[PDB]
Structures are given as C-alpha cells and as structure tokens.
UniProtKB/Swiss-Prot annotation, chain B:
Record's keyword terms, sorted: Acetylation, Chromosome, DNA damage, DNA repair, DNA-binding, Isopeptide bond, Methylation, Nucleosome core, Nucleus, Phosphoprotein, Ubl conjugation
Further information: In contrast to vertebrates and insects, its C-terminus is not monoubiquitinated.
Family classification: Belongs to the histone H2A family.
Name by which UniProt lists this protein: Histone H2A.1
Shown residues in whole-protein numbering: 18 to 119 of 132
Gene Ontology CC annotation, any one: nucleosome
Gene: HTA1
Function, as annotated: Core component of nucleosome which plays a central role in DNA double strand break (DSB) repair. Nucleosomes wrap and compact DNA into chromatin, limiting DNA accessibility to the cellular machineries which require DNA as a template. Histones thereby play a central role in transcription regulation, DNA repair, DNA replication and chromosomal stability. DNA accessibility is regulated via a complex set of post-translational modifications of histones, also called histone code, and nucleosome remodeling.
Expression induction: Transcribed during late G1 and S-phase, repressed in G2.
Disulfide bridge map: none
An annotated GO BP: chromatin organization
Subunit structure, as described in the record: The nucleosome is a histone octamer containing two molecules each of H2A, H2B, H3 and H4 assembled in one H3-H4 heterotetramer and two H2A-H2B heterodimers. The octamer wraps approximately 147 bp of DNA.
Originating species: Saccharomyces cerevisiae (strain ATCC 204508 / S288c)
Curated annotation (Swiss-Prot), chain C:
Effect of N51S: Confers UV-radiation sensitivity
The record's account of how the chain is modified after translation: Monoubiquitinated by the RAD6/UBC2-BRE1 complex to form H2BK123ub1. H2BK123ub1 gives a specific tag for epigenetic transcriptional activation and is also prerequisite for H3K4me and H3K79me formation. H2BK123ub1 also modulates the formation of double-strand breaks during meiosis and is a prerequisite for DNA-damage checkpoint activation. Deubiquitination is performed by UBP8 in presence of SGF11.
This protein's UniProt keywords: Acetylation, Chromosome, DNA-binding, Isopeptide bond, Methylation, Nucleosome core, Nucleus, Phosphoprotein, Ubl conjugation
UniProt subcellular location: Nucleus; Chromosome
Gene: HTB1
Record's protein name: Histone H2B.1
Family per similarity comment: Belongs to the histone H2B family.
Intrachain disulfide bonds: none
Residues annotated as signal peptide: none
Modified residues (N6,N6-dimethyllysine): K1
Gene Ontology biological process terms in this record: chromatin organization; negative regulation of transcription by RNA polymerase II; postreplication repair; regulation of DNA-templated transcription
Record's subunit section: The nucleosome is a histone octamer containing two molecules each of H2A, H2B, H3 and H4 assembled in one H3-H4 heterotetramer and two H2A-H2B heterodimers. The octamer wraps approximately 147 bp of DNA.
Molecular function per GO: DNA binding; protein heterodimerization activity; structural constituent of chromatin
UniProtKB/Swiss-Prot annotation, chain D:
Source organism per UniProt: Saccharomyces cerevisiae (strain ATCC 204508 / S288c) (Baker's yeast)
Post-translational modification summary for this protein: Glutarylation at Lys-68 (H4K91glu) destabilizes nucleosomes by promoting dissociation of the H2A-H2B dimers from nucleosomes.
Keywords: Acetylation, Chromosome, DNA-binding, Methylation, Nucleosome core, Nucleus, Phosphoprotein
SS bond partners: none
Span of the entire protein shown here: 25 to 95 of 103
Function: Core component of nucleosome. Nucleosomes wrap and compact DNA into chromatin, limiting DNA accessibility to the cellular machineries which require DNA as a template. Histones thereby play a central role in transcription regulation, DNA repair, DNA replication and chromosomal stability. DNA accessibility is regulated via a complex set of post-translational modifications of histones, also called histone code, and nucleosome remodeling.
N6-succinyllysine: modified positions: K8, K54
Family: Belongs to the histone H4 family.
Gene designation per UniProt: HHF1
Protein name per its UniProtKB record: Histone H4
UniProtKB/Swiss-Prot annotation, chain E:
Post-translational modification: Phosphorylated by IPL1 to form H3S10ph in a cell cycle-dependent manner during mitosis and meiosis. H3S10ph is also formed by SNF1, promotes subsequent H3K14ac formation by GCN5, and is required for transcriptional activation through TBP recruitment to the promoters. Dephosphorylation is performed by GLC7. Mono-, di- and trimethylated by the COMPASS complex to form H3K4me1/2/3. H3K4me activates gene expression by regulating transcription elongation and plays a role in telomere length maintenance. H3K4me enrichment correlates with transcription levels, and occurs in a 5' to 3' gradient with H3K4me3 enrichment at the 5'-end of genes, shifting to H3K4me2 and then H3K4me1. Methylated by SET2 to form H3K36me. H3K36me represses gene expression. Methylated by DOT1 to form H3K79me. H3K79me is required for association of SIR proteins with telomeric regions and for telomeric silencing.
Residue numbers carrying N6-propionyllysine: K19
Additional remark text: Present with 213000 molecules/cell in log phase SD medium.
Modified residues (N6-acetyllysine): K19, K27
Modification N6-succinyllysine, positions: K42
Modification N6-methyllysine, positions: K42
Gene: HHT1
Keyword Acetylation: yes
Residues of the full protein shown: 39 to 135 of 136
Name of protein: Histone H3
Main localisation: nucleus
MF GO annotations: cupric reductase (NADH) activity; DNA binding; protein heterodimerization activity; structural constituent of chromatin
N6,N6,N6-trimethyllysine PTM positions: K42
Length: 90, 102, 88, 71, 97
C-alpha cells in the first residue's frame, strides 16, 4: 500500500521554526552595534526572541492569507501587507 | 518658589502629594520629584502650542476642541503617543480617496 | 479641590498671549495631564519593581520608553536642566 | 550590511509554514522590511532595559520584560 | 431634471459630514436603547444624562473608526460597495472577539 504510511506517520505533522541561527544572530548583532557599540550578546535568551519574532511573522502571513482569499487570489501583493500593518495598529 | 527657583511653573507640591497618596513606592525619589512634572510640562507646552496654532489657522481666537483634535492628529509622533484614546466632540481629518473621485 | 486650570492657562499665555480657551478643552487638558501623569508614574513604579531593591534615573528611563524618542530626548534634557536650576 | 543574510528559500518555507504555496517576487523584500520594522523595536526595548539595568549583558528576564509589552 | 449621477452628490455630502463634528445619533432613541439594554440587570438605575452622552460619543467614535477601516478593506478589492464580507473581516482581523 501507498497510503497507510501517510496515515500512521502523518498522525503527527508539526512544522518548525526555521530562520537560521547564525545569520539571524549576525543580523541582530549588526543592528545592535549602532544602538550600542561593543554590545556583548548573551548566548541565552536569544531563542525566546527568535521564537517571538517568528510568531509575529506567521501571524502576519496568516492575516495576509486571509486578505488574499478575500481577494479570490492566492499570491501576495504589497497591498495586503501594508493594510495588515495599518489595520493591526502599527 | 520651588517651581520659580527651578524655572518651572506647574505646581510641584500637588504632584508630590498625589504620588505620596498613590503609594507607588514607600520612599519616592526626592532628588527630583518635579522632574516627572517637568516632562509633562514639556508635553503640555507642545500640545498647547499645536492647539493654539490650529485655532489661529481657522480665525477663531479660542481653542476649539476640534482645533485641538487636528492639532494632535496631524502629528504622527503624537498619534503614536496617543492613538487609542478619543476626544469628546472631536473629528476626523478629511480623507477622500483619489481613485474614488469621478 | 485643587484644579490645574491656572498652570495650563499660564503656559498657554506664555506660548500664545492672544488665544483663548474653551470649557470643554479645559476638561480635555485636565484629563490628558492627569492620565499621562498616572501612566508614567505607574511605569516608574514598575521600573522600581524592576530592580531588586526598594530617584530620578527611574523616571528618566520611564519617560525614555513610554513616548516617541524624538520628543523623549527633549523631555529628558529639559528635565535635567530644570533639576540643575533647582539644585541651588 | 548583512540584512540580505536571510535567504529566499527561508522566506519560501516561512510562507509554506502559514499555508498557501503562492509566493510573489518581492514578498521576500516585504518581509525583510517588516522584520526591519519589528526586530529593531524588540531589541530597542532590550536596549532601554540594559540602560535601566546598569548591566552590560542582556539577561532573559530583562529581554522578556521589554518584549512582552508588544501585546 | 436636476438629477445627478449616483455618487455625484455623495462626495460633496461626505465632505459635509467629515467637516462637521456634531451628534449623529438622535438622543431620544439612544435613551430608549440604553434603558432597554440596561433594565435587564437592575431597577432604579437612575442614569445621569452625562453618562449616556459619554457612551453615545464612545459608540459613534468606535463606529466611525470601524467604518473607515472597512472602507479601506473594501477599496482593497475592486469594489466600491460594502458587503458583510468586509465588516466580518475587519471585526475578525483585530480580534475584538
């Protein structure tokens, strides 16, 4: 059979946080240098930030996907993103 | 007075009594208890100048509440500071979509 | 009862000597001043609870994240100038 | 000058996380803009926490305290 | 016949309101609605007219903010007529309830 695998190992589909650790860390140190030069980033408490940012993003894509299906279209234009930004309140 | 010696004009002692009654801390910072009044004085000066300008724009001598409304709403920084709060008998900036026009 | 009409009146008078006021606007200003005071003061209280302990640095920092930075630097600078004037 | 570090397939799987397999040609630039408009604030709050911590090292409590104010 | 095309006076009349700042809701029916929705809890409430004025201003402000937001949400699509879809989307987006 070719379905039961997709039934017994697909009882648990989760998906994960993805933004790469080293590039993200380099980026945040880069935008932290100008705010305060020689800012030593503690290697802890950065996973919590790197989960919170992704959470807010996936909220933004779910809102823009709702807006997209509201426009009978699957692709994303800048209009959806900017109105999501404005209507959320920032 | 204390405000005069400080160059301020808002009554500092009233705010000191208010903070003492509010008991936000057992021993409030007495090094500069009027400093929190000074920042509020600066913000009040900003908003009062903007309101006076708005009232002067429409030839009305007195501060219309609507004049204050557009004075605060025009400033993007002011809108970010206070945007979740409405004003009684306020208004809305005239915003007509360009593509809406015939 | 102690109203705050006199102080806002004289501030308007030192920034606009020929512009009047309306009664509704007086309550508007009073409520604005009161609620901004309370907001920043409870922010200072939570900033005092921030540090593992029981001044002016707390209030400066509290005004430093509550309102947009552009006006925040002016606020802290003029507050410091006021305390320097009041020091002696 | 490393904002371009976030790669395009990273954005594509980020969109895949939220559903819909349709992706534009500048949605990556847009999400770069929104992260530049979000993370600068969520690290500026931590900067103010460090200023009001007398502390040169960011800790978990300070950064989470500065972060939770978003909502 | 001095009949203008549909919408010709609409822009003018919108300008007329968005200039104005008065009470857009008749006070007496608002009092009727307030009493009807408040008598379901306790008798002898003894409302003060300033209070009902306050909630009247609050509700009109909330409604105009809502309506401008749904106007934006509708001008998103190739639509100039408002339908329940935009209202529901605006209500759900901000997570009011």
């Amino acid at each position: 059979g070719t379905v039961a695998l997709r039934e017994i190992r697909r009882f648990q589909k989760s998906t994960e946080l993805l933004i790469r650790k080293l590039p993200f860390q380099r980026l945040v140190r880069e935008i932290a240098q100008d705010f305060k030069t020689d800012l030593r980033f503690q290697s802890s408490a950065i996973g919590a930030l790197q989960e919170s940012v992704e959470a807010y993003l996936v909220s933004l894509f779910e809102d823009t996907n709702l807006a997209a299906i509201h426009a009978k279209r699957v692709t994303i234009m800048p209009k959806e993103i900017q109105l999501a930004r404005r209507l959320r309140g920032e | 007075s204390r405000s005069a010696k400080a160059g301020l004009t808002f009554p500092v002692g009233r705010v000191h009594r208010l903070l003492r009654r509010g008991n936000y801390a057992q021993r409030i910072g007495s090094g500069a208890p009027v400093y929190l009044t000074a920042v509020l004085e600066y913000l009040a000066a900003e908003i009062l100048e903007l309101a006076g300008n708005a009232a002067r724009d429409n030839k009305k001598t007195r501060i219309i509440p609507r004049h204050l409304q557009l004075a605060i709403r025009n400033d993007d920084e002011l809108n970010k500071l206070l945007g979740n709060v409405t004003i009684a008998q306020g208004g809305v900036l005239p915003n007509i979509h360009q593509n809406l026009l015939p | 009862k102690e109203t705050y009409s006199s102080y806002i009146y004289k501030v308007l008078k030192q920034t606009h000597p020929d512009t009047g006021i309306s009664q509704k606007s007086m309550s508007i200003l009073n409520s604005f001043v009161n609620d901004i005071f309370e907001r920043i003061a409870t922010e200072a209280s939570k900033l005092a609870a921030y540090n593992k302990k029981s001044s002016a640095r707390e209030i400066q920092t509290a005004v430093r994240l509550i309102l947009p930075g552009e006006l925040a630097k002016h606020a802290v600078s003029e507050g410091t100038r006021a305390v320097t004037k009041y020091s002696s | 000058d490393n904002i371009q570090g976030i790669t395009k397939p990273a954005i594509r799987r980020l969109a895949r996380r939220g559903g819909v397999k349709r992706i534009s040609g500048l949605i990556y630039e847009e999400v770069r803009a929104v992260l530049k408009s979000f993370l600068e604030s969520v690290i500026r709050d931590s900067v103010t926490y460090t200023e009001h911590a007398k502390r040169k090292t960011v800790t978990s409590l300070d950064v989470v305290y500065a972060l939770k104010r978003q909502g």
